Symmetry: D3
């Protein structure tokens, strides 16, 4: 019983961590696809796929979730939405259910015959607070804040803006 979740994780926030835990209550393993793995250094997508892999890895580990319970797979975007589901399939282990609140992701997997569950704190809010010197830290697990400090994430986002 393997589920699949897709998200840009720009950056990985508390809400996403919560949803991952709830998901792990109903499936044995979870494939966590980091979408738009090719985008970085922009206002909407500040971090590279590798940096996000670290954010997810450190955060899940720090929250006690065993590494054997999930797969972290960066997935580049493609121009043709009609092939994106096949694109994901080709890069991942088999899965039974898909979790997403993204209308496009839901519709594509749904048309493909997959059971789509929408999940029961938004990157936008987080990146906006980093830019306006608001309180972004409280919206993220401490392990993630730590990675962002280590890679100079705020310094990057501010210079880009």
């Amino acid at each position: 019983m393997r589920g699949l979740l897709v998200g840009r994780m720009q950056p990985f926030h508390r809400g996403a961590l919560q949803v991952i835990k709830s998901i792990l209550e109903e499936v044995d393993e979870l494939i966590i696809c980091i979408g738009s793995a090719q985008l970085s250094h922009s206002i909407r997508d500040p971090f590279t796929a590798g940096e996000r892999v670290m954010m997810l890895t450190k955060a899940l580990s720090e929250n006690g979730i065993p590494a054997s319970r999930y797969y972290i797979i960066p997935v580049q975007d493609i121009e043709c939405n009609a092939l994106w589901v096949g694109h994901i399939k080709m890069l991942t282990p088999p899965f039974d259910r898909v979790y997403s609140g993204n209308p496009l992701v839901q519709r594509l997997f749904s048309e493909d015959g997959y059971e789509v569950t929408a999940p029961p704190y938004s990157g936008t809010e987080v990146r906006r607070r980093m830019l306006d010197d608001g309180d972004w830290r409280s919206l993220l697990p401490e392990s993630v804040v730590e990675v962002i400090d280590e890679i100079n994430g705020v310094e990057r986002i501010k210079h880009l803006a």
Copy 2:
């Protein structure tokens, strides 16, 4: 102390498993990049990236190596060799040493300033035995043989040939 190993894993054999174990003796974690993640269904590259993720995952787990000791990241190839190292960096956590016996991989990482260690049983031999009805099973961990049977790998390779 994180190392990086790159290979097509078509399919993941005993020799590669042995090398992974030896590598894990000198580094804390190992990033295992599955190269040519975009190629599948050909004589040289029979399996999709997702199928190889399963082969690696099951095999490492079955050999007792904890999931927290490694990262499995499928990496698509790119046309420009000159950017491939940056391509890998962008998709992965930071690493200190690179392990490879592939001249091209060694040279590219070397020119980039990385310390390249060549590893102390070849996909070609394995795929050739699958095609000629030779003894391919003995060259692979049993968990891998199991995945290949589950996905009808031999049936696929024979029809393609």
Copy 3:
């Protein structure tokens, strides 16, 4: 005497059908290129190229226009506008005149030395009525409405929105 018309046909409406008929009065055959053949499942481009081929095919046939009078060729977009005309040429039979009301299409073919005729009811209006439950059906040939019902087009566009 072969003409060429390019359009996204998202979806194929009454106005476009009318223009096609008028065009067929002055040329023997018409090459109908379905532009942006790679885009689907978005607000501006709901339908795949194949679905649009069906919309065009059924509609022209239903309006009595013989199949031998035209060619339906899906054309993917390319990043470089400067090569798009050559792109179209490479995928199509030879043509003498180009019909379009799209400034970009007119300018590109014009710079290439082609005679461009602007045609003597807009996808946008159609898709907006599908979304707002307005009267979209009356803007389209009945064969097209039929295809949209068969492929659940409205259900798709609403979920995406």
Copy 4:
């Protein structure tokens, strides 16, 4: 009842025409996909997709097959074999059976759940005779020979060689 046939048609020969006729005995319409639509001016792929569309169009028409019985759709190749079937689907009307003698095409459609029928005179032979001044004309329908003369096909292939 719609079938699908895929081929490079470099150039369209007598054997392929024969197979198309036999296929049209068991299905109402046939989607004829011209594969490798992006390749031209090489020894293995001399002609552009548009030139092949003309070869097919003229030949089928000349052999009395009504235009309403088929669809000619040029299809560009893609790097990932795993997505090629979805690629074809996205560009075409729905189909029930697939006809091919190409192992790769058969395997891909088969894995996708499609019924694949292998067809009951080879481009290679044709192009080899064009190059060695052998008898290529007899291997092709006269309408095709005519198109090749009109576009200077032999002159092209010889200069390239």
Copy 5:
């Protein structure tokens, strides 16, 4: 001592010429990269890379700057910002300093370890005056105005708009 400057040059204006001269006071040679070399015929990017090469070439020559003092290299954009610096490196001679006022360009080269100097009259203003019949000519070197007249640049931009 070689510097590097990157810009779209849509079109090459007086301000950019001034900056190039000042730059040539502190470095022996200057690599001038024409960014977005693949974009043309749009409101933001009217001219092809080749047309811009002519604008730069004629203007620098006309202002007395010796050809041996610079390199004009058109550079296509790429999707992954993380590899763009390596992309530039691969296409150019070695350079010691980078000059730019573009935050993204500055940040990318900075993260790569390069010394970035922001330069001590904007394409947007120029293109806006061409469209509104304002005074665009005075914002450009006369050699550039001449190239634009020769290629019918204004006629193009107006038709596109």
Copy 6:
């Protein structure tokens, strides 16, 4: 009166230099396109486009040819031969004649309506001597040998082999 020459220049040899000089006797300026600008670090294409720009630049300068007499423009390859000529046009200043001994290049430009002149010492021979420790230096201008030593070209080619 501007001519155009295309070559991979892997590496730039004496014969190519000779041809460039002869060409400069019949045209005012010469556009020298470095083909396959995206390929590097392989047996057939050892050097990056930037390294080749240096080889050409230094060699022409050293042979007394004024920089104002030519343009060095790296050109990436594209999959569709049918668009390659338009690709070159888009990246370059206008030209009147094309010089090449490459059948494909000759045929493509010829079909496009261009006057193609075949030129009145082969990279292959040069790279083979670098690999077999033969006498490669004598086949190249000294400025080129110098660049190769500076970038460790032989060390690279040998490791790759």
